[PDB]
Amino acid sequence: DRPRFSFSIAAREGKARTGTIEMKRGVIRTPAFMPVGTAATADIILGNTYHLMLRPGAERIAKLGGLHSFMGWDRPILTDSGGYQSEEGVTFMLSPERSIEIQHLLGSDIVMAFDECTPYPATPSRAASSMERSMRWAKRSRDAFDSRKEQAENAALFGIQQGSVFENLRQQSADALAEIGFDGYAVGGLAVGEGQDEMFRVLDFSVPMLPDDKPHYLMGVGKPDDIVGAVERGIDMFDCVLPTRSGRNGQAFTWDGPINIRNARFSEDLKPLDCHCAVCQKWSRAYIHHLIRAGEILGAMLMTEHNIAFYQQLMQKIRDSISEGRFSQFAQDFRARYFA
Amino acid sequence: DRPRFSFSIAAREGKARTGTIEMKRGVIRTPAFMPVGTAATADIILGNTYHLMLRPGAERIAKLGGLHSFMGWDRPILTDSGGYQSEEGVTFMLSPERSIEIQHLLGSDIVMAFDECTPYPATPSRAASSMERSMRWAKRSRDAFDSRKEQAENAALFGIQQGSVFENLRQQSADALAEIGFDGYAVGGLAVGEGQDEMFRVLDFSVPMLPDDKPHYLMGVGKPDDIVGAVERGIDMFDCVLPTRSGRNGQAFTWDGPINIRNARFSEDLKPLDCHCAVCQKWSRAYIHHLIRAGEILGAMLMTEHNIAFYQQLMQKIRDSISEGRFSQFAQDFRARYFA
Ligand SMILES: [Zn+2]
Ligand SMILES: [Zn+2]
C-alpha cells in the first residue's frame, strides 16, 4: 500500500525536476499535466469544485459515493478550492472551512487551500493585503483539513503562494506557507493576463522560494510553450482549460504549433492531426475539418481527445528528456519547431 | 472473395426473415440497422449524399480517395440518392444520372435510385403522377448505374417503391421496379408523418408485392417499436436519424422505453442507462445527467454511443429470435415492457 503522500525527485537538469508523487490511489509522474476529468472518457484529473457545489451539490456527490465513483475514476483527483467578500470568506457562502469540507465531501485526493487570487495588475499595497489574507486563510485551511481524520489521513493539502509580481511579497508568502507546512505548494496569481515574459520573470524568483523537496504546481498554465518554460523554472504540475476549450472551437495543438482545423487549407489535407494518439492513427485533417464544419459532435470529441493526448505526449517527452539529461536540448528543439 | 451482392434468407417466422447480404466489402446481417457513419467512432453505415455533395463535394471526396478512406470505414456503405423540378430532375442540379454519378464518386456499395418522395397526404392522382415519374427515374438510374463498369461490377443498386398509401399504386410501382430489376427494393414514401397504424397498414400490403428473394429496406424508420413491427411485416433493413438526434437532445432508448436523461429524476439515479455497451458498463444515469446538464460534449457523445449500441442490441435480439422461431414471443415481450 502506497503512502498518503510521498514526493521523490528522480532526476534534475538545471531547475527542472522529474519524479513521482505516490498517493494511496496511485502514482503521479512529474512534471504532470492534469486534465479536467469531464473532458473525455493522465495520472490525475481535476474536479470542478465551483461547478460541483452548484450542481448537483457536494452533499449530493457525497451521497452518490464521492467523485471517484461518480466519474468512474479510481486514480487521484485534485480539486481547486473554489475561490477563483470579508475576512470570514466570500458570499455570492464560501470560506476556508467550507471549501475544505466541500472538497472532503467530493472525496478529492489533493485539496487546494482556500485563497484569494489577486487581480492583475495590482498595486503593492493591494497585492500585500490580499496575500496576507490568503496566508491567514491558508492557516485556516490547514486547521480545517487537519480536523477531519479521513481527510488528514488519506488526502493531501497544497498551499497557494500569492503576492502578484512582487518579489518581497512572494518571499513573505512562501515563508508563511512553509511555516504552516503543506504537502505541495502552488504558485497562484499568475496566468491572469500578465503575458509570458512577465510570468516567466515572476517564476524565476518565486519557485526557488518554495521548499525544494515538495511539488510545485503552477495553476492555470497553460499553452505548450508556457509549460516547457515553467518546467525549466522548476514547476512540477500543470492544469489548463486550453486543450479541452480549444477542441470545441477548432484549435488543435501540434508539434508545429496550433492550427485551426476549420480553415479551408485543411479540407483536402490527408495528413493526421499531427502523434501517437488513436485520433492521429485513423483520422485525417480533412475528415476532422469536415466533421467540425458540419457541426458534428464527433469532430469536437476527436479534437479534444487529440489535444489531451498531445499534452500527455508533451509531458512524457519532458520527463524523459529531464531523466536523460537532454531537457535543455529538447526545450530548444521544441521551440524552434513549434514557433516555425 | 465474396460476391458483388448475394442475399440469403436463413430463417423465417411469419413474414419476418433473417439472413445475410454478402458484398465485396463484407457481410450484412439482416434485419439490419444502418447508422449514420458520422455519428461515432453495425455491418454497414450510411453516407449523407446531399450533405457530401455540398461539402466538400463529391469530386473532392473522390480526390481524397472516396468515402471509405475518408471516413476510415472499410465495410459497406449505403448512400441515399439525394432527392429527399421537372422530368429531367431537380434544380436547387440533380437527376438520376447525376445522382448515380455522385454516389459513384463517393464510392458507396449500395446505391439508391433517384426517386421523388411523395408528400403526405397526397391525392390518388398526385401520388400516381409522382410514382410514375419515380419509375421512369428508376429506369434511368438503372441505366446510369449499368453504364459505369466499376459501379456495375462492385456496387449494388436498390429501387424505391412509391405510391403513397394506395395499394393499386404500390402494386404498379412494385411491378415496374421488378421488371427493371434491382438488387434490393426499398419501401419509400413512409415515415413522412403518417403515424404508425397507417404505416403498418401500408406495409401490410406493400412488402409482399416486392420480390420475396430480395432485401426490403424501409427508409427513414424508425423508433424501436416501428422497427419491430416492420420486421414482423417483412422488412430487412432500416435507417433512422433518431438514435443520433436523440443523443444530442437528452433522449436515451432503453428496454423500458425512451427516457429524457436531463430530467431531475435521474440526478441521483446510480443505475446505468439501461444493456451491454461500454457506456452502460461504467456510467450511471446520474453522471450522464450531470454531463448533459453541464453542456459537456462528453455527455452527448456517451448518449449517442448508448443509443447506437441499443439499436444494434435490438437488431441482434430480433435476428436471434427469428432464427430460433421465437420472434413473435420476443415482439410481444418487447412491447409489454417498452410501453410499460
Ligand atoms: Zn493525435
Ligand atoms: Zn448502454
Swiss-Prot record, chains A, B:
* Binding positions for substrate per the UniProt entry: 80-84, 115, 162, 189
Which pathway is recorded for this entry? Answer: tRNA modification; tRNA-queuosine biosynthesis
EC number(s) given by UniProt: 2.4.2.29
Q: Which InterPro entries match?
A: ArchSynthase1/Queuine_TRR, TGT, TGT-like_sf, tRNA_ribo_trans-like
The intrachain disulfides are: none
Free-text function comment from the UniProt entry? Catalyzes the base-exchange of a guanine (G) residue with the queuine precursor 7-aminomethyl-7-deazaguanine (PreQ1) at position 34 (anticodon wobble position) in tRNAs with GU(N) anticodons (tRNA-Asp, -Asn, -His and -Tyr). Catalysis occurs through a double-displacement mechanism. The nucleophile active site attacks the C1' of nucleotide 34 to detach the guanine base from the RNA, forming a covalent enzyme-RNA intermediate. The proton acceptor active site deprotonates the incoming PreQ1, allowing a nucleophilic attack on the C1' of the ribose to form the product.
What is said about its interaction partners and assembly? Homodimer. Within each dimer, one monomer is responsible for RNA recognition and catalysis, while the other monomer binds to the replacement base PreQ1.
User: This protein is called what?
Assistant: Queuine tRNA-ribosyltransferase
Q: Which organism is it from?
A: Zymomonas mobilis subsp. mobilis (strain ATCC 31821 / ZM4 / CP4)
